[PDB]
């Protein structure tokens, strides 16, 4: 039965916001089992509150927040949760006073800045959020979540060149996960330029050697190579090696979809052959 | 094993001191937890440490990225007067509550013998293992209590685990980063990959 606890913990660990199941299991486990659980419920309240905000209810929010208040009176985290409550109901300046206060009584506190920025972004404004986030990063380096958010924001502003610099800062450290290299390759391939596609195939490869079961990296390599084999600016040797790259990748994709098939094979073979 | 000893000794002087030392080695841990402090020193130092660590990791594994980028940051760090390192300028507690208690004991449980150690010892160490006795004829395996206490101490170390300047630093980073090779180190992955086959059998 305790499985519910471990599933909640899982969703806490690998952030998996869906805020439909969470609130259910929370309200189930917010009951008498609380006294059974023992000194562990508080995190479950901090986790159910946010998912509830995500579901629209807002009724369970104050119950969880007031439990938190009564246990931890002079806290800071519950203050952040009150700021969240405010900004959901669209009291922005109040929340700003709050965050500036608990930064004023604690300058080396990050969460207040990272909520001020969420507010600045929820208004619609981006360009000032970016410089605020950089002025933050100008002090609190080693904030990987921030680097990834910055990369996403530069992407949605259609500046694909500095997002790559952030991804460099972010896959230099923790260089054992495919996702970062893959997203770097997608950035570059989108950026255009042969000098970049030569990197796109490289990193779509390295991101495959690691996992060796990813699929997006595979199609990425296939498309990068196939497009190299038509750009009339490279010596023959380039094109002849990219042809074999693409053909081998095609064979491997054939293997994969064959495993899958136990009608798709038709369409994928068409895609293969048409070039 | 030639002697016959009172069982009351076992009861009332042996187990007490295989217990006391255990609970004191626990309390020492819990109190050390309750004691340690933690500063809020400054934004400046934390930022400086963070960037120094960025430099460290750069020097360590800055060889999975384009060369020009590595060189660009290396320039932003080393470039004369632009480089970041060229613009910014600025036991006892353990031992003592163990040595103070042996004394209490040897002042309290003094005038008798406690137990035997099954390996023969050297004779010169006798006068300090017994400490009450006036035989000067026994072998030294027959000990007093204090020795049992200290033995317990050393024997229960390993069984709690089972149940539980700025500018110079900057300049040294700069100097150790001057001499550095990119060594891109990704320039055969393509072949290596498409060398035997693709490997996945968990679908």
């Amino acid at each position: 039965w305790e499985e519910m606890r471990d599933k909640m913990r899982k969703w806490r660990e690998e952030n998996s916001r869906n805020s439909e199941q969470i609130v259910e299991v929370g309200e189930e486990l917010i009951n008498e089992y609380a006294s059974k659980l023992g000194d562990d419920i508080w995190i479950i309240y901090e986790q159910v509150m946010i998912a509830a905000l995500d579901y629209g209810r807002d009724d369970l929010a104050l119950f969880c927040l007031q439990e938190l208040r009564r246990q931890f009176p002079g806290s800071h985290r519950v203050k952040r949760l009150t700021g969240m409550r405010f900004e959901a109901m669209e009291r922005y300046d109040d929340a700003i006073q709050l965050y500036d206060r608990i930064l004023q009584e604690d300058p080396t506190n990050t969460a207040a800045r990272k909520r001020k920025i969420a507010i600045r972004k929820a208004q619609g404004k981006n360009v000032e959020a970016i410089r605020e986030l950089n002025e933050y990063l100008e002090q609190f380096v080693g904030d990987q979540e921030a680097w990834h958010e910055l990369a996403e924001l530069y992407i949605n502003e259609h500046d694909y060149a500095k997002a790559a610099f952030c991804l460099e800062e972010l896959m230099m450290t923790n260089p054992h996960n495919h996702l970062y290299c893959q997203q770097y390759a997608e950035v570059k391939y989108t950026q255009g330029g042969l000098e970049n596609l030569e990197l796109s195939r490289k990193y779509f490869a390295q991101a495959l050697k690691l996992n060796n079961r990813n699929m997006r990296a595979l199609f990425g390599l296939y498309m990068s190579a196939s497009h190299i084999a038509s750009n009339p600016k490279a010596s023959a040797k380039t094109k002849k090696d990219n042809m074999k790259y693409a053909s081998w990748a095609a064979s491997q994709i054939n293997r994969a979809y064959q495993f899958a098939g136990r009608y798709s094979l038709k369409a994928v073979e068409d895609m293969l052959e048409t070039l | 094993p030639e002697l016959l000893l009172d069982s009351n000794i076992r009861l009332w002087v042996v187990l007490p001191i295989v217990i006391i030392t255990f609970f004191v080695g626990m309390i020492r841990h819990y109190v050390s937890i309750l004691l340690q402090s933690d500063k809020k020193l400054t934004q400046e130092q934390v930022s400086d440490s963070q960037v120094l660590i960025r430099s460290r990791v750069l020097r360590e594994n800055g060889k999975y990225i384009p060369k020009q980028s590595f060189l660009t940051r290396k320039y932003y760090f080393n470039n004369p007067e632009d480089g970041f390192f060229k613009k910014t300028k600025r036991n006892v507690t353990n031992v003592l509550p163990m040595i103070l208690i042996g004394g209490w004991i040897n002042m309290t449980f003094s005038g008798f013998v406690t137990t035997k150690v099954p390996f023969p010892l050297t004779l010169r160490f006798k006068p300090m293992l017994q400490q009450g006795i006036e035989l000067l004829t026994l072998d030294a395996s027959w000990v007093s209590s204090a020795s049992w206490y200290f033995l317990n101490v050393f024997g229960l170390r390993s069984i709690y685990s089972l149940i539980l300047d700025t500018n110079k630093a900057f300049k040294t980073e700069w100097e150790a980063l001057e001499l550095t090779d990119h060594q891109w180190a990704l320039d055969d992955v393509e072949e290596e990959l498409m060398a035997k086959d693709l490997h996945f059998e968990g679908m």
Binding site: N134, H158, Q191, H227 | -
Partner: peptide
Amino acid sequence: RFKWAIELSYPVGYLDKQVP
């Protein structure tokens, strides 16, 4: 002939100078 070809088009430690 690739039918669907698309073309879409200060951070501390970022310069563009092709430094050697």
